[PDB]
Amino acid sequence: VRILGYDPLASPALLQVQIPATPTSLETAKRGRREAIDIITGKDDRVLVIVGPCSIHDLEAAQEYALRLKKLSDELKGDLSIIMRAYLEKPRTTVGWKGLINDPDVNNTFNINKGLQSARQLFVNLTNIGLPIGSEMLDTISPQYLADLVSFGAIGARTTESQLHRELASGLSFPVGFKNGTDGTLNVAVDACQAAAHSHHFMGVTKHGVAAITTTKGNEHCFVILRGGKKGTNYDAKSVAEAKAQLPAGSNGLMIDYSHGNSNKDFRNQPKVNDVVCEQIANGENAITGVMIESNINEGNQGIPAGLKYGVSITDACIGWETTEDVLRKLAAAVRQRREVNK
Amino acid sequence: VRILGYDPLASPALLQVQIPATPTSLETAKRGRREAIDIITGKDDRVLVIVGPCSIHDLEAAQEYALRLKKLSDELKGDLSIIMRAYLEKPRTTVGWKGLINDPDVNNTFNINKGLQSARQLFVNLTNIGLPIGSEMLDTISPQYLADLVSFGAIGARTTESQLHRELASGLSFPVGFKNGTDGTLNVAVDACQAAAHSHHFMGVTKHGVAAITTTKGNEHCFVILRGGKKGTNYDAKSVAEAKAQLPAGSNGLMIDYSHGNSNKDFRNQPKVNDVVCEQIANGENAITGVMIESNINEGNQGKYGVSITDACIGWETTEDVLRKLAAAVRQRREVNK
Numbered sequence: 001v002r003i004l005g006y007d008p009l010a011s012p013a014l015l016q017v018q019i020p021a022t023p024t025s026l027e028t029a030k031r032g033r034r035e036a037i038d039i040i041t042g043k044d045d046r047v048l049v050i051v052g053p054c055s056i057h058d059l060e061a062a063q064e065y066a067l068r069l070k071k072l073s074d075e076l077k078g079d080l081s082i083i084m085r086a087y088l089e090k091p092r093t094t095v096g097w098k099g100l101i102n103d104p105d106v107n108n109t110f111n112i113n114k115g116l117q118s119a120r121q122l123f124v125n126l127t128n129i130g131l132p133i134g135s136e137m138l139d140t141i142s143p144q145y146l147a148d149l150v151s152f153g154a155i156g157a158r159t160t161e162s163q164l165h166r167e168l169a170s171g172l173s174f175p176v177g178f179k180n181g182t183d184g185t186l187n188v189a190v191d192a193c194q195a196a197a198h199s200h201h202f203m204g205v206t207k208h209g210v211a212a213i214t215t216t217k218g219n220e221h222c223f224v225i226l227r228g229g230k231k232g233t234n235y236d237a238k239s240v241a242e243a244k245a246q247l248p249a250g251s252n253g254l255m256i257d258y259s260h261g262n263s264n265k266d267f268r269n270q271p272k273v274n275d276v277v278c279e280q281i282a283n284g285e286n287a288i289t290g291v292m293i294e295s296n297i298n299e300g301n302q303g304i305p306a307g308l309k310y311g312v313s314i315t316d317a318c319i320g321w322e323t324t325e326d327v328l329r330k331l332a333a334a335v336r337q338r339r340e341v342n343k
Numbered sequence: 344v345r346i347l348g349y350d351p352l353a354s355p356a357l358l359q360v361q362i363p364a365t366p367t368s369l370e371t372a373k374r375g376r377r378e379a380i381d382i383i384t385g386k387d388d389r390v391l392v393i394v395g396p397c398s399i400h401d402l403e404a405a406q407e408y409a410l411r412l413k414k415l416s417d418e419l420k421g422d423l424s425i426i427m428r429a430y431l432e433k434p435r436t437t438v439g440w441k442g443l444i445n446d447p448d449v450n451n452t453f454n455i456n457k458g459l460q461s462a463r464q465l466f467v468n469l470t471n472i473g474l475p476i477g478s479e480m481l482d483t484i485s486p487q488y489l490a491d492l493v494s495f496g497a498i499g500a501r502t503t504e505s506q507l508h509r510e511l512a513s514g515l516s517f518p519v520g521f522k523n524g525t526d527g528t529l530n531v532a533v534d535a536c537q538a539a540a541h542s543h544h545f546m547g548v549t550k551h552g553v554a555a556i557t558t559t560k561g562n563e564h565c566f567v568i569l570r571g572g573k574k575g576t577n578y579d580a581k582s583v584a585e586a587k588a589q590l591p592a593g594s595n596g597l598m599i600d601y602s603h604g605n606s607n608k609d610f611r612n613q614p615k616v617n618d619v620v621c622e623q624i625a626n627g628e629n630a631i632t633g634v635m636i637e638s639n640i641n642e643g644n645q646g647k648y649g650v651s652i653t654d655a656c657i658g659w660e661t662t663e664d665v666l667r668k669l670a671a672a673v674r675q676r677r678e679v680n681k
C-alpha cells in the first residue's frame with residue numbers, strides 16, 4: 001500500500017561487464033588502498049587527504065577537477081597521499097537531491113539505472129588517470145556496483161550509529177572513515193570502528209542482484225573522522241587530545257574533516273582549520289594521519305533551477321581550486337616539518 | 344577480501360507460503376493499524392500503548408506474555424489501544440546479540456533462515472490470538488518477510504537520522520515512530536517524520552528476493568517518540584512543551600517511551616515516568632497520544648524463564664498497575680476535555 005511500484009534494475013555483475021574497469025583503474029584503486037592503510041596504521045608519515053567536491057553531478061567537470069588534482073598529487077606525493085572525493089550519495093537533513101545515482105538528471109526523474117551507469121563510468125574515468133577515489137557508503141546495495149573502484153569509504157555523521165552501516169563497513173575491502181555524530185561527539189565513531197572490526201552476518205544483495213546471507217570478516221582499517229557538530233568544532237589540539245584519550249588499544253590514526261561541522265557554516269573557514277591542523281602536525285602531532293576537504297573547481301555552491309554554473313557545487317559550499325592548491329601545499333609543508341620533529 | 348561467503352536465503356514470498364498468516368492474524372494486524380492511526384492523528388482519545396519485552400528470545404514465553412496482555416487489553420480497551428512489543432532486531436552499542444532473526448539459537452551460529460522462520464511463526468502465533476504487535480524496523484530487508492503481520496514499526500534512536508531508514512519508513516504500510524536521537528534532542532526525529540512523509544526512490548529487495556527500484560508513496564503516519572538521552576530525560580511537562588513547540592503543522596501526536604533514556608539506567612523508573620505522564624494526560628495534555636513500555640513476565644534482566652536477555656523490564660504485575668493507572672488518566676483527560 002505505500003509501495004507505488006518496483007522498476008527493474010541491472011545486477012551488479014551485469015553493470016560490471018557493461019562498464020569494465022581498465023587495468024589502470026584497478027591498479028589505481030588497489031594502490032590508493034595500500035597507501036591509505038599504511039598511513040592510518042602508522043607505517044608511512046605522509047598525510048592521507050580526501051579532497052574534492054561535496055558531490056559529483058557533472059562527469060566532465062569532475063574529470064577536469066580530477067586532472068588538476070592528479071597533477072598536484074604528482075607534485076606533492078612525497079608528503080601527501082591524495083584520494084579524490086567522488087561522492088555519489090548525499091544524506092539529507094529532510095529531503096533534497098540525493099546524488100548522481102539516485103537522480104543523475106537532477107530533475108526528479110530518478111533514473112537509478114542511468115545513475116549507476118553514470119556513477120560507474122565516472123569511477124572508471126577518474127581511476128583511469130591514476131587518481132584514487134572515495135565516496136560516502138550511504139546505500140548498502142550500491143557498493144556491489146562500484147567497490148572494485150573505490151579506495152576509501154566514509155560512513156556519514158548521520159549513519160555512524162547505524163548497525164546496518166557498521167555491518168556494511170565490516171565487509172568492505174578498503175579503509176572506512178566513520179564521521180563523529182552530528183551532535184559533535186566522538187563516542188559513536190569509536191563504537192562504530194569497534195563494531196565494524198568484528199565479523200557480521202546479515203542479509204545483503206549479491207553481485208547477481210539477489211538477497212543472501214552475507215558473512216563478513218571484520219574491517220581493521222576503520223578510523224574516526226572529526227567533523228565537528230552541535231557541541232562545537234573539534235579540529236584543535238585540545239579536541240584532538242580528548243579524542244586520542246578515548247581511542248582503544250589497536251586504534252588507527254584520526255582524520256580531520258575541515259568542512260561540515262568544523263567550518264561553522266562557512267567554506268571560507270576550511271583554510272583556517274588547515275592552519276590549526278598544520279600547526280599541530282608541524283609541531284609533532286602523530287595521531288592526525290588524515291584530513292578531508294570539500295574542494296571544487298570554483299568556490300561556493302548554487303541552487304538547482306542544466307541552467308547550472310560550471311564547476312560549482314549543488315550541495316555544500318566548497319573552497320575553489322586555487323584556494324585548494326594553497327591549502328594542500330601548506331599541509332605538505334607541515335608534513336615535512338613533522339618529519340624534522342620526529343628525528 | 345572481506346566477504347567470508349554467501350549462504351542461501353529463503354525468499355520473502357516462500358516464507359509467507361511456508362508460514363501462512365491466518366485470517367485472524369491478518370485482521371488483527373489491520374485493526375492494530377487502524378487503531379494506532381486514529382489515535383496519533385487525533386481522531387480517538389484513547390492512548391496508544393506499545394508494551395512488552397525489550398526483545399523476544401523465547402517463543403513460548405512470549406506467547407504466555409501475549410495471552411496475559413490480550414486479557415489486560417480486553418479489560419482496558421475503552422481507554423487504551425495496546426500493541427505488543429515483539430522486537431526481533433536489536434541495535435547494539437558495539438557488538439552483542441542482534442535478536443531472534445540474526446541468531447535464534449543465541450549462541451553465535453547465526454542461522455538467519457531459522458531466525459526468519461521463528462520470527463514469522465512468532466508473529467503469526469501472537470497476532471492469531473487477536474493481539475497486534477510492533478517491532479523496530481532495523482534491517483531494511485526483514486520487513487519483506489513480516490510486514491503483513493505488523494501494526495507498528497519503530498525507527499530506533501541510533502537510526503532515526505539514517506536516510507535509508509527514512510526511505511524504508513516512507514514505504515511501510517503502518518504507523519512508524521521515530522525515536523529522538525541518543526543525545527536526547529528531537530530535531531532529528533522531527534526531520535525524519537518530514538522525510539518519511541515524502542515519496543522516495545531507492546534500491547530495495549522485493550518479495551522474490553531480488554533487488555529492484557522501489558518507489559514509495561510517503562508515510563503520513565510517522566510520529567516522534569521521546570526516549571531521553573545524553574541531554575537528559577524528556578517525559579516531563581517542560582520537555583513535552585518544548586517538543587510541541589518544535590512540531591510542524593500537520594504533526595501527529597507524541598509518544599513517550601518510559602524506558603531507555605527515560606529510565607536513567609533503571610527499569611524501576613518506568614512506573615515513575617508513568618506517574619509523570621499520567622499527571623499530564625489527566626490534566627488535559629492532548630499532544631501525548633502514545634506511550635512505550637518495556638515489560639516482561641518477570642522483571643529485571645540477565646546475561647531464567649520470562650526474563651529479558653537485553654534491557655531490564657518491569658514485570659507482569661507492575662505492568663497491570665501501570666496500565667490501569669494510565670487508563671484512569673485517559674478517563675480523566677476525557678472529563679477535562681468536556
Ligand SMILES: [Co+2]
Pocket residue numbers: 054259260294315316
Ligand atoms: Co558536504
Ligand SMILES: [Co+2]
Pocket residue numbers: 397398602603637653654
Ligand atoms: Co530496550
